Amino acid sequence: ENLMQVYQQARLSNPELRKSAADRDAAFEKINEARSPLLPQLGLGADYTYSNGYRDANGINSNATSASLQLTQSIFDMSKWRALTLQEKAAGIQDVTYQTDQQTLILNTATAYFNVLNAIDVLSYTQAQKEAIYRQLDQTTQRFNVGLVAITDVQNARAQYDTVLANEVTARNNLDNAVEQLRQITGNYYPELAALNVENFKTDKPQPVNALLKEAEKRNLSLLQARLSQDLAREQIRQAQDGHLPTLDLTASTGISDTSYSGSKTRGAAGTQYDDSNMGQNKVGLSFSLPIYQGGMVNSQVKQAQYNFVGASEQLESAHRSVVQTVRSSFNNINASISSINAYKQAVVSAQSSLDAMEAGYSVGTRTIVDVLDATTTLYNAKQELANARYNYLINQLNIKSALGTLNEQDLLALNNALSKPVSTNPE
Amino acid sequence: ENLMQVYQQARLSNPELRKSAADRDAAFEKINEARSPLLPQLGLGADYTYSNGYRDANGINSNATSASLQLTQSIFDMSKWRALTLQEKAAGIQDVTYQTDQQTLILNTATAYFNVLNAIDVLSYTQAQKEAIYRQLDQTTQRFNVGLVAITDVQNARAQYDTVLANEVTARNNLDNAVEQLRQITGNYYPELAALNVENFKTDKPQPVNALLKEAEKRNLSLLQARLSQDLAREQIRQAQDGHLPTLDLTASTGISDTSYSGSKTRGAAGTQYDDSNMGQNKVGLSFSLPIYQGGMVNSQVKQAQYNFVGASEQLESAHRSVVQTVRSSFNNINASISSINAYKQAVVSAQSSLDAMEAGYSVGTRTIVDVLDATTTLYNAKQELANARYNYLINQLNIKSALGTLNEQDLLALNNALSKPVSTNPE
Amino acid sequence: ENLMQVYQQARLSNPELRKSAADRDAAFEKINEARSPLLPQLGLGADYTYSNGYRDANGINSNATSASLQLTQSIFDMSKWRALTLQEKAAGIQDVTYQTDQQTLILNTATAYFNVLNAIDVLSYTQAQKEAIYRQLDQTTQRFNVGLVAITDVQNARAQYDTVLANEVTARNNLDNAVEQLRQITGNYYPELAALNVENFKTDKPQPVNALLKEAEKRNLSLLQARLSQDLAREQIRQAQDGHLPTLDLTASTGISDTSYSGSKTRGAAGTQYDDSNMGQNKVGLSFSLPIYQGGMVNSQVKQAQYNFVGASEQLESAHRSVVQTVRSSFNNINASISSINAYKQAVVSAQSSLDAMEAGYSVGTRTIVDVLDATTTLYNAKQELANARYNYLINQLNIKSALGTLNEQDLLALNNALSKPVSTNPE
């Protein structure tokens, strides 16, 4: 399983990505819910009012029943238009949030894959170091059993070998936790993963930092969220300023009234005083309203929206400083990874030559066995450092493509063509 | 003070636990507040309306006063039943939150206690290493003062001794910060804590990981929070779908009207045109309402609740992946701690033998004084690593009992029976 | 650019500080918005109601138009006074939040400045170590080219030199990331910063911890936020208990009614049955309301507010424990920094003497070249540790002045007088 197939399995079933997709679609249905109250509203009503009279109403009872039909439709209300535009802008913010955690999904599965590969070759280098130290210990024990060296050398070799055994144990644990992190990201357990080439692994210097700064100012998704939040705050200002505005709405009705009377006073001139009525009504009428003075509520809301807009502009400037820091730090990290790859290749070559030299010097009696053992540790530390530098170079390539906001599937396709051969994620 | 007494003092007075208990009881009183609006509501009203007429009402004044008594009781309203069930489910979620930070309190006081003990024996091992290196330096100074060795050996011993002095200083600082963390957790300062046995400290391999996975799927509290959030979201769907429903409510009243008239037009036929009235009324009447079309608000609310339910199911799946990762990582950590305990015991034995060997080789002239000093550092590093491995084994036992959701007081009782002897938390 | 000028540029243009200032001013305008509804409210109204009759109203049409003017002013409403006092307390909480992230701005720019200086002298010490090891390698190569030493020594020196080259690369990267962090804090790129004196750098022991505890109990801003949140919760209790209270409000009006009639039944006795009216009205009337029983809503709100007050008091106690832990940990850190400065000065002196001794012993044939190289590494590690201890002492001075809540500009003025000389933030 190479990186592309891991990402194909991950994007298809990651829970956080689908949760963000659910939030995006909920925001679009909120657009529909905010466009709702500008439409016609129909509602039916009915009543059945028993009544009783007393204290100069004694003997007057009534059973008034009714059944109405309402219709409401606003004619000029600016606040509902403002709420509709605000919901559209909030859905745009939710859409760019979905885009940015698509990017974060790609970055997370890439760093989990490379953490697994780094744990694999750290375990393999620790195993090779343990093998070399055990070979030295076995050779010195064969020397001691014929009486050629003292027991100090085999005891020092035994001590070094036991320390490397403990390091191998904790390296195996780190491998198991790394593959558990990969399972937690993708949802699958992988027996083998494609490893990295080392014989044709070449590094490329990135673009100049000004071109990256211009592309980050054009394309970074956090800066887009900040810009959309700023224009949303300006729309909040407009929403309060249109809270100043008057109102006008239309209302229609259709209702039947079936009032009837009973009681002792209705045994009098109930004809034309309290008589039954089959009355129906068709009503259609406007309604105007104009808030003149509200105690300064709308002015305080305008000033609150202005202070919130100033805060949103400061949020935009903070996000701009953060993205500048991000692209400059990742640029420095890429150059650091290239220089450290070259330095660690040179260090590996020199440490190998030094290990051969100290082995010859120990065989001639210039160096001790402790010299051979710590030369071995320095060599395998240099090898582990070289592997870490390679994986840091690849993850910094992904970080510079994410901070530009252009991280997508084809970058994974490129550094998936970087990978070559299947290595097992669980050796014996 | 052993671990059980520390937990008894901590659970009795920890602020975060009592804050969660306050939130739980607030949720139950919210259940009562949500069952409130289905009950009778009584409210009294009164008026005193002075009036004045003009423009074909000139000469008509009125002083209409009134005093009413209202009663309201809904008959068929499904939304209030939905709100009651939603508040019951929210209180269940608050109850399992109280349960899970009970568990987190137990885990936090356990890890603070073991951090204090680990800082204690790291300080004691650094002190013993400083004592051994000072003994070597004093012996080489006594050798140099009679003119047996060169000044290079005593200068190397002085350099190593000063480095170990600085390490002792920072170890003492780590001990003080650890006991301050314990005071911040429990609220008490402890002069002495019960230390760990080493002569009868035995490790037990945990259960197979499938049994732990089944018990974690049955009992983990985060998975219970996810399940209750999912069925809460399904109840939100039902709440919108019952927002489709019609309504019906009952209303009773009892009011007196004491209208009186005055003015120039009431000097006319105010008898039976504008005459005083002592009128009282007993009213009891129903009210029906049926929303036919609302501009699609209820359909958009249904689709929003469905998208929120899909998001809650994705939250459930993410919590399931997280608890699988947690139990597998803690299982691997337990096995790692057992293997590292065995490896570090072997390393301690071999490093002690190697230190004796290099001391004899230095006394015969095979090794240097630098050999004795770094052999001492490797020995005391192995001792510190063994102590760290023991405490990591105990805290991983607690982590596997917490990730199963079964962590309680009796597990602290067991690994409190593991502890034996009081050691001071502040030596000189 | 010393620390004072960096702070002057930072406080003038930091985005987070201005965002908090915007939130503070928004809270004060919320005070005005909450004092709004106790003032007069004026609102105009108008109608135009076409009507139609049928089913014992057939032949009765009406075109009733109107234009009113409303005035509303509450007389006795305790809930609005409670909301006003609650908004005043919330604005006080926002003000102390603005104060505490003023303090956090000062602490952040101080720690960024000292991180840059620490990265600078770590890079310079690594460069000096690389220079010394290269000098040793060149001297041994000149010895080997005349046939005085073996090739093992120059190969060991080459291996050590390549390892120090890799360390120099990553130190240069750490310097670049530190100056990028400083740019992200202040907004400016600094070519040179004022460095620290070492020839007149003296340390002062802090106050006794009880005086710091009393001053932290009087002046710490998190404890003030906790106290204001607690009295806000008590005001919430009072707000529910005054939700028990009755109500009383005043209402005035002025409206014209211009009803006219048309239809077939108005061709009858429309004179005095359905005749036109120019009717105007001046109305001024009170309104009383008293909630007798609400289904226990107000009692459940009182119990919810009481549980929230208990939770706020537990929050206060947790903040008290946290500030006690903060001042005690920073006190221990200051004493640790003083003791480690003394220990590292002694270690630097002894390591320098030991390096000279092992150089002489290598020249006489007692020590090897590996002895000289790791003596050099221990010396330069001691130098880096001394520099780190000095900067930790200064940042712990700032932490003890921040945890006392008294951190301001003049403390930066004092430890800005500590700084002396401009060093470049980007060497070649």
Author numbering:
A (entry chain C), B (entry chain A), C (entry chain B): 23 to 450
Sentences from the study reporting this entry:
We recently reported a high-yield TolC preparation by refolding from inclusion bodies and inserted refolded TolC into nanodiscs. The cryoEM structure of refolded TolC alone is similar to the previously published crystal structures of natively derived TolC alone or in complex with hexamminecobalt but with more splayed loops at the periplasmic opening (residues 165–175). There was local variation in resolution within the model with lower resolution associated with the extracellular/periplasmic ends and the nanodisc scaffold protein. The lower residue resolution at these apertures may indicate dynamics not captured in the X-ray crystal structures. When resolved by cryoEM, addition of ColE1-T to TolC breaks the threefold channel symmetry and the additional protein is observed running all the way through the TolC barrel as a single-pass, all-α-helical chain spanning more than 130 Å. The maps refined to nominal global resolutions of 2.84 Å and 3.09 Å for the TolC and ColE1-T:TolC, respectively.
